[PDB]
Design a protein around this ligand. Structure first.
Ligand code: DMU
Ligand code: C8E
Ligand code: C8E
Ligand code: C8E
Length: 387
């Protein structure tokens, strides 16, 4: 009578071939080329009856080495020993109790947060996870309030957890990551304004402002979004004084399966974008291999999408984008330039025994006069088994 009625168990399967090719010689390491199979166990109970409902969730991970050689092993699909050898496997299991009162919900334990201020990475074999507690509340129509504290994370290619730190810096760690968020949706569900504040204890404080609108016009579906991060050092300020403002925004137009979109992004201040180690960001140029977040980096993006439904081939989609950056500072030089060209093709079998089986290919070129030039390919096989 509930609890057992809204319960679900799924087994996510991801077969991944990853090949990042470094073009410049001597690159010391010529290549990251690995192949792995991941398993993602997610089991949720429903909630016990009563005004205060209890429930529990479980996240299980298993990554298996299918092919690797130490000369080419840092791909991020697998943990990597000091000898340079990939692990043959790694696993992880976290439980997550949950309470629900009215329209307010609390989860503690192993978490998969997808927050503008803390976006869990899923760019390899197995998801990044966090450890702590999340509150989510929507007692008011249109409004969603967020609060929580994280204490540790587990990176995508690790069984283990570790204290939090900031991407690209390390050295300074924290026990305590506290946030608060508010999100108001209006104009017949079209417009939305967001407000966020996060505090990585004794390292940084980060504000985030968000503005977005989405509206259909006959056959056109236009979308506009703009966000702003403002990050300063905080407390004892272990990384020292920090100073980044980071702007992002795009506009998107879609009609008859075709999508075109332009994006802009700019890093202001002595520091580039500051975020939690290994985490993703909602910045528009956070793309396949690079995210264009170096100090002072100004960048834009043009993106094209097509949904092959219209041709009579549903499940087939294609995407291409070009990202260009300038004025990046890298001790060696200011006016650092880079450009990345991504190509995404995906197919999902829509009928038959193999319904929902998915194959996706991601290809990227990156060239720069500061970053390492790369060519990257990933083959991704996907399927989700309900239990
Ligand atoms: C379909 C997929 C189902 C897979 C389920 C299989 C069960 C998983 C068995 C191993 O699980 C892991 O064991 C690691 C070794 O013990 C732990 O390291 C963790 O354990 C800590 C101590 O608890 C520390 O040693 C580390 O830093 C790290 O956090 C970790 O938390 C745990 O998840
Ligand atoms: C990050 C959460 C802490 C890890 C808790 C351990 C989970 C152990 O339970 C898993 C196995 O339980 C079997 C019952 O089903
Ligand atoms: C050297 C060129 C890189 C090889 C792949 C480029 C993109 C091919 O995809 C075309 C379909 O996408 C639309
Ligand atoms: C060397 C052998 C590795 C080949 C891996 C190719 O299979 C990738 C399947 O993903 C789709």
């Amino acid at each position: 009578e509930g609890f057992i009625e809204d319960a679900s168990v799924s087994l996510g399967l991801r077969n991944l071939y990853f090949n990042r090719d470094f073009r410049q010689p001597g690159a010391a390491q010529s290549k990251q080329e690995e192949w792995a199979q991941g398993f993602l166990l997610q089991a949720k109970s429903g909630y016990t009856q009563g005004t205060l409902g209890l429930g529990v969730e479980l996240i299980g991970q298993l990554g298996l080495k299918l092919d690797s050689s130490p000369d080419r092993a840092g791909s991020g699909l697998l943990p990597r020993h000091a000898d340079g050898r990939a692990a043959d496997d790694y696993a992880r299991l976290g439980v997550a109790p949950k309470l629900k009162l009215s329209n307010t919900e609390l989860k503690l334990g192993e978490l998969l947060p997808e927050l503008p201020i803390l976006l869990r990475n899923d760019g390899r074999l197995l998801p990044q996870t966090f450890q702590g507690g999340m509150l989510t509340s929507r007692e008011i129509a249109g409004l969603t309030l967020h609060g929580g504290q994280m204490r540790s994370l587990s990176q995508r290619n690790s069984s283990d957890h570790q204290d939090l730190s900031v991407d690209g810096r390390g050295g300074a760690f924290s026990d305590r990551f506290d946030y608060l968020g508010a999100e108001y949706r209006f104009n017949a569900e079209r417009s939305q304004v967001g407000l966020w504040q996060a505090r990585l204890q004794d390292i940084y404080r980060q504000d985030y402002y968000s503005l977005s609108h989405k509206q259909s016009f006959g056959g056109w579906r236009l979308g506009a979004s703009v966000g702003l991060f403002d990050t300063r050092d905080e407390g004892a300020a272990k990384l020292g004084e920090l100073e980044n403002r980071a702007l992002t925004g795009f506009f998107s137009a879609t009609r008859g399966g075709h999508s075109l979109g332009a994006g802009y992004q700019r890093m202001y201040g002595d520091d580039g974008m500051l975020y939690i180690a290994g985490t993703s960001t909602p910045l528009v140029n956070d793309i396949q291999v690079r995210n264009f977040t170096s100090a002072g980096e100004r960048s834009w993006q043009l993106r094209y999408d097509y949904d092959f439904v219209a041709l009579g081939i549903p499940g087939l989609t294609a995407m291409a984008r070009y990202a260009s950056g300038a004025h990046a500072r890298t001790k060696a030089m200011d006016d650092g330039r880079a450009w990345e060209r991504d190509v995404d093709v995906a197919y999902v079998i829509q009928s038959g025994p193999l319904k929902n089986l998915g194959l996706r290919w991601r290809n990227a070129m990156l060239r720069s006069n500061h970053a390492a030039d790369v060519d990257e390919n990933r083959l991704i096989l996907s399927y989700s088994l309900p239990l």
